[PDB]
Design a protein around this ligand. Structure first.
Ligand SMILES: [K+]
Ligand SMILES: [K+]
Ligand SMILES: [K+]
Ligand SMILES: [K+]
Ligand SMILES: [K+]
Ligand SMILES: [K+]
Lengths: 95, 95, 95, 95
């Protein structure tokens, strides 16, 4: 299950890297703003402080959302159940 | 399962076409902006760079969200489990 | 299952009515804008074209989200599986 | 199950407290606006009336979303099934 989580973890990083590179280059965002934008899109928070202005950027975002949500959400759930939950349970039993 | 995914795939396309046509016509968006708006609403990202200004558009959006989320989300999950997952597993075994 | 869906359906209506009344009165929105705002909050689209300006409105929105998401999402899923799905299947068999 | 819900309930409070403190201090929001922002981020509504302006705040928000969504969503579901549902069923049987 550490190997389940590692694969998902890695795939998320690669996914957020892909959005960082595209949005920084095509839409002109600072690298840190691209990442933060990529994270805020794929978790569907969507503040809208950043949003794509070019048509290429709009098209890309369509496909990035559809390809990216299922992964991101899969990692978060794996993180909650296989990492966050056990550490919670462990804190309720003094060793 | 390719036939499960095809039906959902098709139904999503038709759903996004429906929003493209309405928002372009009633709210005046360029076709590409309507589509991008439709995609950003039904995945609940909701940047808000576009949002309906007319009462008809507001009413329509209410019903489009309720009818449209269950489908969109169903396709994304089908896409993740029946397409994205297998291709991931296949990349871990040289043929 | 029509009785499952009816109860949820009703509970959603009552929930959106509650938000319509509060936001129209406390935040001053037109009734139609309150409803549209209530729908856009509880489905977590969150365009932000409307958002509460008063502290009372901010507090209320906190609790409305937590009480309201589980219901709304429950209705949408019931709608997708017990209404939308069957009608889809029925359209693939000429009577 | 009251003990399931209590643990989750508590963990959510602590999570929203953590965001209240950071956003009030680092981003300068009034305590009430930080809380409301924290709640609106972790439920992925994301109105965007508030959004982090500093790079530290942007980085923090990335990790807060990933750590925080799984919890928040877990509480809401526990709330819907173990508290909201039973009280609904109880209202359909006069004692
Ligand atoms: K959302
Ligand atoms: K959102
Ligand atoms: K949003
Ligand atoms: K927004
Ligand atoms: K979900
Ligand atoms: K969601």
């Amino acid at each position: 299950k550490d190997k389940e989580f590692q694969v998902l973890f890695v795939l998320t990083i690669l996914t957020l890297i892909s959005g960082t590179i595209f949005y920084s280059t095509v839409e002109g965002l600072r690298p840190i703003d691209a990442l933060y934008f990529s994270v805020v899109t794929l978790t569907t928070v969507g503040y809208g402080d950043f949003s794509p202005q070019t048509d290429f950027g709009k098209i890309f975002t369509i496909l990035y959302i559809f390809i990216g949500i299922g992964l991101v959400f899969g990692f978060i759930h794996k993180l909650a159940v296989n990492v966050q939950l056990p550490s919670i349970l462990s804190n309720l039993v003094p060793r």
